[PDB]
Design a protein around this ligand. Structure first.
Ligand code: CLA
Ligand code: CLA
Ligand code: CLA
Ligand code: CLA
Ligand code: CLA
Ligand code: CLA
Ligand code: CLA
Ligand SMILES: CCCCCCCCCCCCCCCC(=O)OC[C@H](COP(=O)(O)OC[C@@H](O)CO)OC(=O)CCCCCCCCCCCCCCC
Ligand SMILES: CC1=C(/C=C/C(C)=C/C=C/C(C)=C/C=C/C=C(C)/C=C/C=C(C)/C=C/C2=C(C)CCCC2(C)C)C(C)(C)CCC1
Ligand SMILES: CC1=C(/C=C/C(C)=C\C=C\C(C)=C\C=C\C=C(C)\C=C\C=C(C)\C=C\C2=C(C)CCCC2(C)C)C(C)(C)CCC1
Ligand SMILES: CC1=C(/C=C/C(C)=C\C=C\C(C)=C\C=C\C=C(C)\C=C\C=C(C)\C=C\C2=C(C)CCCC2(C)C)C(C)(C)CCC1
Ligand SMILES: [Ca+2]
Ligand SMILES: [Ca+2]
Ligand SMILES: [Ca+2]
Lengths: 74, 31, 157, 38, 157, 154, 40, 31, 40, 31
């Protein structure tokens, strides 16, 4: 049997308690411990995560600019 | 000036694009 | 062979079936979206599906006559829209029930509960109730628009 | 609640959506995903 | 042809069953008409049967008190009719449910899904919802009889 | 046998006791005949009755204590609060059934299935909306109910 | 729309009955009939 | 003089007879 | 119907409870009880 | 002086005791 989430940890997916939920959130970014992680896939996933983070910073900055323009008194 | 009424609801369509691309990036990173 | 960048593949791995797997016909989003509509959402009995579909449809069927029907320029604009929507939902319920009466005379299948006589009658019942309720609740919102506005603006604090 | 800024009707419905519809939908989807297969 | 111009026969071919095949009891018209009422219509789920019966009954039960009740000569004529019909449908639902509770205590049959505890309870649920709905829509149409009159006469266009 | 407390269902090693509150004739008869446990009922009827009762009584709190209680829209506000809480309760019931009955279906009782729980949710939704609306309609028209109870229209 | 002839309340409900109810019912009956797959 | 309400309603009752006979002739011609 | 006596709101609801609710509920309980096919 | 609103309400509460005792007596006599 398996409860699917989290897909990256059968030791957690087979936890029949609420811990499975909590730890699933706590170990998602620790890519090194995902089941069957390789160094190359580790680096590539980190690369894409960096891209997403840069997009997030740009979106937050755009939010600052847009809200100042729209609802400000600049 | 003040931002145009039509102008505020024009940035949201442009925001639909990073929304789509973030959805794609999330679904691809889940793999 | 390092060539499968193509997004339009054979539908369900069968290239000889009259369909194509495209970003609209068979992509992850469209699949998880249409598949979780009340019509296809797994773990749902037919009457609940009908209830949800009717709620949505009867809710939005108020607008057309409300803003464009002949009573739009009377003192009974919302009442006229409501009456039109209720008649439309009644005719649609009759159509649904007739379809079910004719399509499921023979042997009752065992695939999905919706595709039987009992299941389709339950779906029609749910649709009728949900549609009448959705039309009446959208009517009630429109008629009491001032209290809705005061609520969403905190005017009553 | 009001707003002299343009499109002041947008927060009117957008605050409930960000506060009610969006959270309910995301929490329901994540709850179904947490408790999937079995 | 032959010698049987006779219109009455033994019921279902058994002359020793206490019944007769007559134009009222067993003509083609009555077989098709009774047999297609919500109570007997083939393949229907008991929920839809109850819903339809309740719609018809709740709709027509508003009239007697509306035109002849004690509030008929007051400002609350149609509300009086509605209150009466709603209370009557509530009592009727309690009667239907008590009936189901008492007659299906033992083993459940198999041929008639309406003649079971689950089926009769579904019938009662559908009858409650349909009766309340029909009564309230009859009341709503009567309370706005002027707009229905103007609709039917074209007094708004 | 003067003791009124005994083992539950004749098993002293099951985590329960048989007490006047947990396992008496009145509790057995009352709880066992509530719409949740009444024998033979279909899930949609259980749900309908439960929803009727709950939507009915959920009108009161916001009616008398909510923010619009001091406005010209008191009853409408209580109605809206009740309807929204019932909608969230219905979504909760549906989602519970969605996640608890994923695989094979037990044969014990119709309520404890995917189809049965969704039917109970439909019944609850319909009954709760109806009961809330009838409570609001009685409160909004309390004057005609008063004239009816006092014989003012005779 | 009115009428000064005798019993002018009759078109009031007969026109909807002839235009809406009669066609709906007869088309529904004929529909269930022509689709009936009872053998014969 | 003008026709009366009673005359209009009496003619509908009378027309109930050709209705039943037309139903009978129709259903027999179906045989 | 009015009442100058104290707590005259009591008959307002007590009359429907003694005349409608109590009779209906008790007759329902007795109907169920006298029709129960238990053992004997 | 007239009877009080509170004396009427206190009467029903006190009457709750013989109601419970009558329930117990009836159910015991059913045995
Ligand atoms: C600057 C960027 C950065 C990056 C990319 C990382 C990267 C990582 N850290 Mg690290 N760390 C950082 C900053 C960073 N850290 C900072 C600022 C601190 C001080 C608070 C720490 C302290 C730290 C500890 C103590 C641990 C990590 C852990 C981890 C790994 C798992 C993360 C995870 O899934 O936790 C999940 C994240 C959350 C549940 C967020 C909840 C908190 C919110 C924001 C409130 C991951 C590879 C964990 C690990 O895997 O150890 C080997 C671990 O134990 N980090
Ligand atoms: C010619 C076609 C036509 C016409 C004329 C109309 C006309 C109308 N439509 Mg409709 N519509 C149409 C087609 C059409 N529609 C189609 C094809 C769709 C897609 C199926 C829709 C779907 C749609 C929706 C979803 C809604 C309308 C609504 C309306 C009305 C909005 C104007 C108004 O009264 O302001 C006022 C508008 C509002 C007050 C918006 C309602 C705000 C509520 C409170 C939602 C708050 C959001 C949040 C999630 C709260 C949920 C609480 C929950 C958590 C418990 C209007 C009369 C609205 C309506 O019916 O008014 C009630 C509305 O909700 N339309
Ligand atoms: C991270 C950036 C950011 C932040 C923190 C905010 C903050 C806020 N906005 Mg704003 N907004 C933004 C960007 C942002 N905005 C952008 C770029 C636009 C133009 C497309 C708008 C247009 C917008 C409108 C029309 C309104 C707000 C409103 C609001 C307020 C309520 C949220 C809401 O209802 O609207 C929801 C926001 C949107 C629909 C726009 C999408 C936001 C960007 C494009 C995506 C942000 C993603 C980012 C990674 C965050 C993800 C979460 C994080 C954990 C990863 C809130 C204080 C309301 C307000 O005025 O309050 C009074 C409202 O009326 N925003
Ligand atoms: C405190 C527990 C409780 C509550 C909140 C309700 C509430 C409700 N019941 Mg239920 N009922 C209960 C216990 C309860 N019941 C039990 C233990 C039984 C088994 C004997 C029943 C059997 C019963 C039946 C057969 C029916 C209801 C129905 C109803 C709804 C109609 C309103 C009503 O009857 O007035 C409020 C009732 C009370 C304040 C007293 C509740 C306790 C008594 C013992 C209930 C007795 C039921 C009685 C025979 C039916 C009343 C007739 C009606 C004219 C009021 C309502 C929401 C009707 C319905 O529509 O269901 C879908 C209906 O058909 N009840
Ligand atoms: C935050 C807590 C809270 C609050 C503030 C309220 C507030 C309120 N409640 Mg509620 N209630 C609560 C919790 C609360 N309740 C809880 C926990 C329960 C138990 C689950 C109840 C159950 C309850 C019931 C059963 C009723 C109320 C009612 C009321 C309203 C009565 C005030 C009134 O209208 O006076 C004046 C008095 C009246 C209007 C009485 C109404 C007349 C009744 C309906 C006649 C019915 C009797 C008759 C025999 C019916 C059978 C007919 C049949 C034969 C067809 C009021 C707004 C009443 C109501 O909603 O009124 C419609 C009511 O019926 N409450
Ligand atoms: C075939 C002859 C005929 C024709 C073509 C019409 C035509 C019309 N009639 Mg009239 N009617 C007729 C005979 C006829 N009538 C007779 C004999 C009576 C006395 C019983 C009436 C009593 C009647 C009333 C009270 C009213 C009308 C009205 C109307 C108008 C609206 C339709 C309607 O509501 O009818 C309804 C018809 C009936 C209730 C009675 C049935 C009519 C006859 C008996 C049946 C005809 C069967 C036909 C021959 C079958 C062949 C069909 C063919 C295609 C196969 C319409 C222009 C309405 C009007 O005046 O509009 C302003 C109105 O309210 N009719
Ligand atoms: C056998 C004694 C008795 C009798 C015949 C009556 C008679 C009457 N009372 Mg009263 N009542 C009594 C005792 C009695 N009362 C006592 C002791 C109290 C104080 C608790 C009250 C408090 C009371 C109130 C508040 C009201 C009435 C009212 C009424 C009238 C309508 C009934 C009703 O709706 O109220 C129901 C009565 C009660 C809720 C109280 C319980 C009655 C006693 C305590 C129990 C009697 C049980 C009885 C002996 C069992 C016999 C069974 C037998 C057939 C086998 C009615 C004429 C109404 C009125 O004012 O009329 C306009 C009204 O609103 N009574
Ligand atoms: C432009 C962006 C496009 C996205 C759509 C936007 C609105 C449309 C919403 C429709 C959703 C479809 C619902 C059905 C989708 C659905 O039910 O799928 C199905 C699945 C459970 O159902 P089953 O597995 O039984 O169904 C499988 C098949 O039936 C598929 O059809 O649910 C999930 O997969 C979990 C949901 C993912 C959880 C996502 C995590 C989100 C949390 C993070 C959010 C970040 C927010 C940041 C910004 C603030
Ligand atoms: C002529 C004739 C006859 C008779 C008939 C009769 C006697 C009948 C009547 C009729 C009726 C009696 C009808 C009805 C109708 C009804 C309806 C159509 C209903 C309804 C309802 C509704 C629509 C509702 C809705 C709702 C709901 C459900 C919920 C929410 C609320 C509301 C309201 C929205 C016969 C064939 C035998 C023979 C020959 C001749
Ligand atoms: C999402 C989305 C979209 C869109 C859509 C649209 C455009 C629309 C829809 C909308 C709608 C369609 C909505 C709705 C609403 C509804 C409601 C809200 C309902 C209701 C109901 C109720 C609340 C109840 C009632 C009742 C009953 C039934 C009982 C008795 C009586 C009464 C009345 C109480 C798309 C696909 C594009 C894309 C993706 C996303
Ligand atoms: C005394 C006592 C008790 C208690 C009780 C309680 C705590 C309560 C209940 C109460 C309640 C909680 C009641 C209720 C009622 C409800 C109702 C009666 C409902 C309804 C509904 C209707 C009437 C209808 C509606 C509708 C629909 C659904 C459709 C359309 C719209 C309309 C609105 C028409 C017990 C037994 C435990 C113990 C002994 C003593
Ligand atoms: Ca007009
Ligand atoms: Ca306030
Ligand atoms: Ca009077």
């Amino acid at each position: 049997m398996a409860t699917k989430f989290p897909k990256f940890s059968q030791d957690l997916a087979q936890d029949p308690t609420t811990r499975r939920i909590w730890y699933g959130i706590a170990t998602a970014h620790d890519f090194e411990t995902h089941d069957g992680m390789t160094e190359e896939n580790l680096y590539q996933k980190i690369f894409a995560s960096h891209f997403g983070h840069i997009a997030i910073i740009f979106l937050w900055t755009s939010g600052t600019l847009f809200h100042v323009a729209w609802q400000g008194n600049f | 000036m003040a931002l145009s009424d039509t102008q505020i609801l024009a940035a949201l369509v442009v925001a639909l694009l990073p929304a789509f691309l973030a959805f794609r990036l999330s679904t691809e990173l889940y793999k | 062979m390092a060539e499968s960048n193509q997004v339009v593949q054979a539908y369900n791995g069968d290239p000889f079936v009259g369909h194509l797997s495209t970003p609209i016909s068979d992509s992850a989003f469209t699949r998880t979206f249409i598949g979780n509509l009340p019509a296809y959402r797994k773990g749902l009995s037919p009457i609940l599906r009908g209830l949800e579909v009717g709620m949505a449809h009867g809710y939005f069927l108020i607008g057309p006559w409300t803003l464009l029907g002949p009573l739009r320029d009377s003192e009974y604009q919302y009442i006229g829209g409501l009456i039109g929507a209720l008649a439309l939902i009644l005719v649609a319920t009759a159509a649904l029930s007739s379809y079910g009466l004719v399509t499921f005379q023979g042997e009752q299948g065992s695939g999905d509960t919706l595709q039987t006589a009992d299941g389709w009658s339950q779906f029609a019942a749910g649709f009728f109730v949900g549609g009448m309720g959705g039309a009446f609740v959208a009517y009630f919102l429109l008629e009491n628009l001032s209290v809705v506005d005061g609520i969403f603006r905190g005017l009553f604090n | 609640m009001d707003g002299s800024y343009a499109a002041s009707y947008l927060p009117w419905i957008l605050i409930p959506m960000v506060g009610w519809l969006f959270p309910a939908v995301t929490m329901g989807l994540l709850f179904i995903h947490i408790e999937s297969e079995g």
